[PDB]
Amino acid sequence: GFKQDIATLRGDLRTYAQDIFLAFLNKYPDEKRNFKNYVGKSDQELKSMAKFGDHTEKVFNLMMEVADRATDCVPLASDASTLVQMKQHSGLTTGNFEKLFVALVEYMRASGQSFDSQSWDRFGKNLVSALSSAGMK
Numbered sequence: 001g002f003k004q005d006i007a008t009l010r011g012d013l014r015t016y017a018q019d020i021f022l023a024f025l026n027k028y029p030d031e032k033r034n035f036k037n038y039v040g041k042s043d044q045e046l047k048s049m050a051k052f053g054d055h056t057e058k059v060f061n062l063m064m065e066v067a068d069r070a071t072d073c074v075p076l077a078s079d080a081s082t083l084v085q086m087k088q089h090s091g092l093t094t095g096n097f098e099k100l101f102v103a104l105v106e107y108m109r110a111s112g113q114s115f116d117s118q119s120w121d122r123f124g125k126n127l128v129s130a131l132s133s134a135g136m137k
């Protein structure tokens with residue numbers, strides 16, 4: 001289930017992070033407005049850059065912290081507030097997060113693996129709600 005999925009993801013964090021982020025960018029190419037330094041690069045061109053693996057790992061590490069601190073796939077309001085208040089997230093609205101989680105769920109469903117995709121889809125919806133409650137537009 002969800003807890004075991006956090007363990008699976010953490011076990012190969014950088015690899016899963018890169019592949020999920022790429023699934024996101026490729027599903028929603030307009031989302032690349034937020035990642036101007038990744039424009040004009042294929043998946044393997046991105047993965048080769050140490051900065052890409054470094055960024056994606058730090059992002060997914062925080063995502064896994066947030067997931068692990070959730071109760072029944074409902075994240076803490078404090079974690080939602082951290083995500084709203086991060087300077088790096090100043091342009092963002094809840095739809096940016098919605099899309100990330102639609103891509104993450106789709107990736108899990110297409111994986112050969114027994115991820116609890118419905119738990120991830122609830123977690124994304126609950127995180128969107130929590131972001132809104134913590135003041136994201």
Ligand code: HEM
Nearest residue numbers: 031034035054055058059060062063088089092096097100
């Ligand atoms: C639960 C979801 C998310 C988590 C945990 C998260 C976490 C983080 C973290 C930790 C950083 C700093 C990374 C580092 O040290 O290298 C970061 C940067 C950033 N995040 Fe997020 N993020 C999330 C979702 C999003 C979404 C949906 C977007 C936009 C679609 C976004 C846009 C950014 C951008 C633009 C930066 C700045 C990257 C740069 O320096 O070039 N994040 N995020």
Ligand SMILES: COc1cc([N+](=O)[O-])ccc1O
Nearest residue numbers: 017020021055056059060100
């Ligand atoms: C949508 O923002 C991100 C998401 C991920 N990821 O692994 O889901 C990595 C880096 C990011 O900037």
